[PDB]
Amino acid sequence: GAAGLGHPAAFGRATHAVVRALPESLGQHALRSAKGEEVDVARAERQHQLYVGVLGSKLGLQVVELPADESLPDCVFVEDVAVVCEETALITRPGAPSRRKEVDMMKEALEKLQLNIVEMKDENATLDGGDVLFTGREFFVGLSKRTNQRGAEILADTFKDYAVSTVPVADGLHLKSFCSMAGPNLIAIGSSESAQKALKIMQQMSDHRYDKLTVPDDIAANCIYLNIPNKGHVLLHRTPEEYPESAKVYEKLKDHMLIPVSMSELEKVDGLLTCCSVLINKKV
Amino acid sequence: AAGLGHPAAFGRATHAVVRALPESLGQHALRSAKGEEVDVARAERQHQLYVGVLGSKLGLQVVELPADESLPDCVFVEDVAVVCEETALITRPGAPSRRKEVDMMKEALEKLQLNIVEMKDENATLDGGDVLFTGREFFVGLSKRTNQRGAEILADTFKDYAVSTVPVADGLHLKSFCSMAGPNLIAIGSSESAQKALKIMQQMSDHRYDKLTVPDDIAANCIYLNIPNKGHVLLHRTPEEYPESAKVYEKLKDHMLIPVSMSELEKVDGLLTCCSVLINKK
């Protein structure tokens, strides 16, 4: 019953998505926060293809698919190299120096989409897109092992229409390792002490209180909210096969079109749902 | 061919292990190329007809394992075990997510009272689809799924038979373009890939095999059985699917030819040999 909320300028409206195929080198060579199980690269490819099929085939977005680069094992995680807000694209300077060559082809793709490009070139600045939470009315930027204060300052200078606040992020995480937007004014949030401390800080800094959807698995707090024509609220979330008790929480969004999306292989290299796309609203 | 019936003939089987396909196969099974949408209900009907050939028509005792929705490729039981005489090699599939399929196959082959050997070496991979047993020796394709260590463990397991390796290209298995069509008879595709592999196989062997060349590589995958009171039996792809290849099989005048549809499972590279493990219990 959310279909009445379809609007060309609604929060979460997108027309285009940029994604990038994963290389075979991802299985052995992609960075990961913990030693774990062997990545099944063929299964990861199939899951990525299904994720792309949701964005393009099921939801109707125009998907730009960048080719894999075997020398960039993390290149599937396009979120980290660009932040798009309205008509402006910030090309980031990733915290991991070997990922910085990923920005070149993202830049070309976003230039083709007629976006206004700003490049993070300050040699003292790092920022991963995964540390950036855009709520629809402000930005929160995680200060992490990958994103620093200067990177957040450049983001604030680039997106002059929005307030920007920083939040400290622990250990080897990104801000969106445990949160994301699940709808207008609605933050999905994990249950760990790290996640709860972070939400407390963002709530205290903001002009207004966000609603929250608390899930028991931090990783399952990473979802993709979209507002799609003739549907309204749409949410991609981790499957009940992967995280049954978090999927049950999302089931309460009775006016959302809920789409379960498997990501069990890329999870092994810290790849969550938001990581694998950059969303753009090209207003016609 | 009926006079060729013998409990020790090449291709004699008494039992088959198969596994039902899960609903998740349609969207989640691995596949070599993007293609058409899988019709899962039609795939299931086709699998049921295949099982009916092995059990009802040909009289094998069929062990039917249940589908696991978490293992979308689990219907393809060939890849997880190779059986030779009274010995079963439980393989270590090339795709790591498929390795949990071995558990229930291992269980089934123990109830059949076979000698079980498990490929556990963390450096070894082997898909049963890469293994051609000719009745005289093994050929093992070195592919994106099967490596040298896997073939060595196969050779150490089946000590009564010579084992030789053959390079396999792309996203293929050795039996993506060949299979046994009868005693000393290899069905082989017409492509340059298939012909080069057959040439290598013939150079390494003590003796020359007879061949049956089919114009469609995929239709060179067939199942040969020696069945009591029948002799030569062959399951092959239908004339509706591969008319030019079915014509070639129609030349086997002393084989009982059984056309078997596999049009849906072919979309995820599932051919005839993939869907069963055959066993001869004396």
DSSP string, A18-44: EEEPPPTTHHHHS--SS--SPP-HHHH
Q: Sign of the CA dihedral B60, B61, B65, B71?
A: negative
Is A57 in CB contact (< 8 Å) with chain B?
A: no
* Radius of gyration in angstroms for the set of CA atoms belonging to chain A, rounded to a whole number: 17
Whether B125 and B107 have beta carbons less than 8 Å apart is answered as no
Residues in chain B with CB shorter than 8 Å from the CB of A42 are: 30, 95, 97
Which secondary structure element, helix H or strand E, spans residue B37, and what is its range? none
- Is residue A119 less than 8 Å (CB to CB) from chain B? no
Cα-Cα-Cα-Cα torsion A188, A193, A196, A202, nearest 10 degrees, comes to -120
A133 sits in which H/E element? strand A132-134
Q: How far is CA A105 from the centre of its chain?
A: 18
Residue A43: closest C-alpha in chain B: B30
CA dist., res. A239 & res. A245, Å (int): 10
Give the separation between CA A206 and CA B18, rounded to whole angstroms.
60
Residue B44 in contact with residue B92, Cβ under 8 Å? no
Cα–Cα distance measured from residue A62 to residue A120, given in angstroms and rounded to the nearest whole number? 26
Tell me the C-alpha distance between B40 and B229, whole Å: 36
Task: Kindly state the DSSP code that residue B36 receives in the 8-state scheme.
Answer: S
Q: Experimental method for this entry?
A: X-ray
Long-range contacts of A100-109 (CB under 8 A, 24+ apart): A101/A69, A101/A71, A101/A72, A102/A69, A102/A72, A102/A74, A102/A75, A102/A78, A105/A20, A105/A66, A105/A69, A106/A18, A106/A20, A106/A66, A106/A78, A106/A81, A106/A82, A106/A278, A107/A82, A109/A18, A109/A64, A109/A66
Strand partners for A233? A227
Q: Do B28 and A265 touch (CB under 8 A)?
A: no
**B30–chain A nearest CA distance, Å:** 7
**Residues of B forming the active site:** 173, 274
**Tokens 């269980």 -> residue:** B107
Strands (E), chain B: 15-19, 61-65, 81-84, 87-90, 115-118, 131-133, 137-142, 162-167, 178-182, 185-189, 210-214, 223-227, 231-236, 256-259, 277-279
**Residue A198 to chain B, least CA–CA distance (Å):** 34
Q: Best mutation site among A40, A51, A259 for testing chain B: the one with the most B CBs within 10 Å?
A: A40
With CB atoms and an 8 Å threshold, state whether B97 touches A40.
yes
Q: Could you tell me if B97 lies within 8 Å of chain A, comparing CB atoms?
A: yes
In a 13 Å sphere around the CA of A198, the CA atoms on its Cβ side amount to 33
Sheet hosting strand A82-85, strand order edge to edge: A82-85, A88-91, A116-119
Chain B residues in contact with A241 by the CB 8 A cut-off are 69-70
Our CA angle for A283, A175, A166, nearest 5°, is: 85
Q: Quick check: B208 contacting A, CB < 8 Å?
A: no
Q: Residues B164, B137: contact at Cβ < 8 Å?
A: yes
Q: How far is CA A53 from the centre of its chain?
A: 17
B97 contacts A43? CB cut-off 8 A: yes
